[model samples]
Target: GSSGSSGESEEEDKCKPMSYEEKRQLSLDINKLPGEKLGRVVHIIQSREPSLKNSNPDEIEIDFETLKPSTLRELERYVTSCLRKKRKPQ
Candidate 1:
């Protein structure tokens, strides 16, 4: 029971906005994970996030490869926002 609250706290922390460098590192780490491709991740996010419908997969891929701070920040927001949505009850 004690462990459960700590785990929830950690997940809550992850839902907050991260620094640019932190997002860059997260992007790099996720890119290294198998089946964690940026395009695929973006597709998953788009399916769950109505506001992200206008985002182009190709453009996201290009920006991801560029590794620019601004793009990484945007990706971090989208990913974290999707995650937080999943944690909430409908």
Candidate 2:
């Protein structure tokens, strides 16, 4: 027996705000990986992070292979500062 015809019925998953601890845990998890893996993971996570969602470009791009350790640290610092500055009152 046919249940029903296919339709556009999928609901969008609602995003709940994540706590600081939750974010820290995820960061720690990523940091445990090797530099290449960590770089890729960071790129993926940041591109999806709500805080940086608006700042993300239409196309995702990464060049971690050429990034120096200091550059990576600065990138982290820049992202941290941007999020801290733009964060809404909580």
Candidate 3:
């Protein structure tokens, strides 16, 4: 049994309402932590928020990493203001 191959996609250069992903603000940015730091942020958040389990990146689902400044401030606040400790006592 063979179905059928159906595909031929082109587009107009203009008048398409500009449908593309753009990095705005007030959103998340996955590229910020890439993976390591990202997961770290995730674990920290999860401990703080149970509803944030399973997935934490797409809470708002932008397209900037997927951009969301909320994550930025939240993670920054934890990574720096909350967890950053200067322990070098001798």
Can you write out model 3's per-residue Cα lDDT over 12-74, one digit (the tens) per residue? 332232212322222234444455565565554555445555665546232325324444455
lDDT of 2 by residue, 1-90 (tens): 567675454534233344445455445544556555444544543544555445444343434443333434544554455334665776
* Cα RMSD (angstroms) for every candidate in the order listed: 11.8, 15.2, 18.0
**By lDDT, highest first, what's the ranking?**
1, 2, 3
The whole-model lDDT of each prediction reads: 0.54, 0.46, 0.44
Pairs in steric clash, model 3:
26-69, 27-67, 27-68, 27-69, 28-67, 28-68, 64-67
- Predicted candidate 1 versus true structure: per-residue lDDT over 1-90, tens digit per residue: 655534456655444445656856666655654454445667654554566679887654433443444445556655565444555557
Tell me the spans in candidate 1 whose CA falls farther than 4 Å from its real position: 1-14, 33-37, 47-49, 54-56, 61-90
Q: Which stretches of candidate 2 lie over 4 Å from their true place?
A: 1-12, 45-90
Clashes of 1: 0
In model 1, residue pairs whose N, Cα or C atoms come closer than 3 Å (at least 3 residues apart or on different chains), thus clashing, are none
Which wins on lDDT, candidate 1 or candidate 3? 1
Which model, 1 or 3, shows the larger TM-score?
1
State the TM-score for model 1: 0.35
